[PDB]
Symmetry: C2
Subunit: 401 residues, 2 copies
Amino acid sequence: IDIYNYPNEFEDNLGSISLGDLHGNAIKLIHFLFRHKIIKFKTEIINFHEAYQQFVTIYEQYDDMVQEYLEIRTLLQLIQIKITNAQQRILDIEQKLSLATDHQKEFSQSLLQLKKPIEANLQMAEKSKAGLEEKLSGLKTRLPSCIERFNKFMTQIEINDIKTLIRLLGDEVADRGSCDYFTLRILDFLYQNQIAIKIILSNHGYEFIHAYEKLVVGQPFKPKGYIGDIQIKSFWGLQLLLEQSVITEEELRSLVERAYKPTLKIIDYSLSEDGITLYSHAPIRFDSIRMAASQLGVTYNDSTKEALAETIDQLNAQLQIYMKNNMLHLLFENNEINDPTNMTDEERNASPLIYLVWNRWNESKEVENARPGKYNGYFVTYVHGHDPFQSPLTYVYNLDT
Amino acid sequence: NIDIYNYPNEFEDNLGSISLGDLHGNAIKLIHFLFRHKIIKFKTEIINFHEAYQQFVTIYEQYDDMVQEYLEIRTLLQLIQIKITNAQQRILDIEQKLSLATDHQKEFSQSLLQLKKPIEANLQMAEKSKAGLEEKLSGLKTRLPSCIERFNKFMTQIEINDIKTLIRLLGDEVADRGSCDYFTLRILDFLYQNQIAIKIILSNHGYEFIHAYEKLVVGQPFKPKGYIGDIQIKSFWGLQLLLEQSVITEEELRSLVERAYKPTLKIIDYSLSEDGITLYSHAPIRFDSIRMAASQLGVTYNDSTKEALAETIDQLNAQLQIYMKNNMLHLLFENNEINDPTNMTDEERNASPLIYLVWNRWNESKEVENARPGKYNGYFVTYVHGHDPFQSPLTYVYNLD
C-alpha cells in the first residue's frame, strides 16, 4: 500500500485490527486509521487527497529538521571530546596553582605558562561549539510553524468507527520515523474519542519508556542508547521539541501518562470458542510465557485457554505496576547478554522480557518444538510484528500491516 | 654481548662517564653493569664471587615467577569486582526504591523483593569467588619476606669500589618487564649512600612509575598511568605487591624514592667536551625539540654556545625538579589529544614535547639533514639515546643497547 496518498481502498474488519510495524511513522498510522475507517475527514473538508497531502508535507519537512538535529548532535559530541581534554588538564593545573603558598613563586609562574596555551585551545573549541548551539537556536526558531501546521491538520479529523479494537504490535515510538510527538498526539486523539488501543511492548518502545522514566526522576529525557540514534530518530524528533521548549513537559507527561502508558502490554490475547491467539512484538516461543511469569512472580497456568488468558492478564498487570512506578528499566538491565536477538536458554530465563522484545527468528529456531499450534486441548495462534523470517506455519502471522 | 646472569669475568675501565642503555626494569642487568665497570665490588670476606652473584640471580627469577602469579590473581579479581560493583549498585538501587515505597504498596514491594533475590544470589557467589583468590593472594604474602630477606643479605655483601665515575641510565629503569622495582631502588639507594653521581633520564616506563608515585603521596592508590600494559610494567607490580602486602611500609618506599631516585632524574643531559656538547636522551629525538621543551616549561632558550645550551638544559632540569618536589609531572605527560606518541606531528610535539622525548621512535623518514646536525653554531653535537630498533649511520649518533 501507498501510505503517502489518501487511501482509495477501504477495509472493514472483524472487531479488531493489528498494525504490524509502524516504524515510528505517523503517516503510516494516519493512513492505517483512514484505510480501516477508524477516522475520517469532517464534512466541511472537500478535497480529502489535498488534506492528507498537507500532513505528508509537514511530516517530511519536520523529518529534515530532525536530520539536521542529528548532525548537530554528532558534531557537539565530537567537539565535546576536545573541550573535555583541555578542561581536564586545566582543572588539574588550577588545583596545583590554587594550593600554591607564597613560598612557591617560580612554581606558580611555571604553571601559568603551561596553562596559557591549553586555555587558548579550550577557548577556540568552546566557541566552535557556540556556533553549533547557535545553528540549534536557528532550528528552535523554525519548529513552531511546523507544529502549528500539524495542529491545523488535526483540526480536520474526526472519529468514525468506535467499535474496533486497535492493536499496535510495536515500534510506534523511538524508531526511523519523523516525530513521536505526532504519534502521541494521534494516540491522544484516539484516547479522547474512547477508542480501544493496545500497544505491545517492543525494544524501540522500551528506548522511549527508558527516556521517560529518566525524565521523571530528573535525568535528561534521553534513552538507553543500545539502539543507535538514526534508528530511533523519531524519539529525537520528540526530544527536540522538549529541550527547545516548543512543547511543555506537562504536555508530554499528559500524553504519555494518559494515552501511551495505559495501553502497554507484554503480550495480548483474544479468545475464540476453541483456542487462543497470542499477540506479541517479536516472534517468540510458547515456553517463554512461563519464563516471563517467573520473573514477575506471576503464577503460571495454561491448563485451559482461560488459565493462560488469566496468566497473561496478570503479567500485564505487573507490567502496569512497573509503569506506574516508572521502573520498567529494572527489568531490562542485563549486561551479561551477548546478543539480545539470539538469546540463550540461560539468558532467556534470566531476562525474559528482553527476549520478548528483541527476538529475531531464523530456521535454527524454526523447530517443531518452538510454537505448537495446540496445547492442553486448545488451539494456539501466534501473531507478531514484522520479522524478516517467514515461518510456513499456517497459525503463525508475521504482520507488515 | 655480556652474560648478565653470571658474575662478570670481563672488566673495563671508564673514561669519566658511563652510560647504560636498556635497563628494562631488570636489577640483574644493573648489578652486572655496576660490577663489570667496577663501581661495586664484593667484600673481602666473600670468597666465591660467582656463587654469591648466583644467589641474587636465583632470588630474582623466583621472585619474577611470584610476580606473574600476582598478575593472574589481580586480573581475575578486577573482573570479579566488576561483577560485585554491578550487583551492589542494584541491590542498593532497588533497596532505595523499596525504601521509597509507601506502606500502600503490597504487590509493588512483593515484586521488587522477588526481583532482588537473583542479583543477591549472584552477589554472594561472586563475593565467594573473590574471597578464595584473596586467600591465595596472602598465601603468597607469606612467601615474599623470604625473598626480600635474602636480597638484604646479598646487599650486605657488596661495597663500593670506584667513586670517581658518573653513571647515566638512559631510561626504562622502573615499570618495565623486569621482576621488581624494589631491588632497583635499593641498589640506587646503595649508590646514593656511597656518594656516587648517578643521573637517570626519564622515560615512558619511568613516567608510569612516577605517575603511580604521585598518585600515592597525595593519598590515592599507588596505581600507574596505564598506557603500557601490565605485564610490560611488571617490575612496578613487583614493587606494588610488597607495598600492598605490608612486607614493606610506605615510609621506606617514600624515603627511597624521594632521596635515591627523584633527585637523579634528568630529561636531557649533557657532558661538555673541548669542542662541543654531547646530548643524553632516552628516545631518538631532534635538536629543535629541545627548544620546544623550554617553550613548554618557560625556560629561556639559548643555544648560541655549547655552554648556553648547557645552562638552558640545567634550568630545564631545575624546573623538572620543581615538578617532582610538588609531585606534578603528570601535568606534562597527560595529553589525550595526541593520536600517536611514537610518531608525533609538529603541533603535537610543540604541544607536549616531553611526551615526544620519552616516546619517539626513529625510522628511515625521520632521518633528515635538518634533524640531528653534527655541528651547530660553533660546537659539535653528539647524540646518545636508549635502545631503539632503527640504526642511524651518522658517526655522532649512538643508539646504546
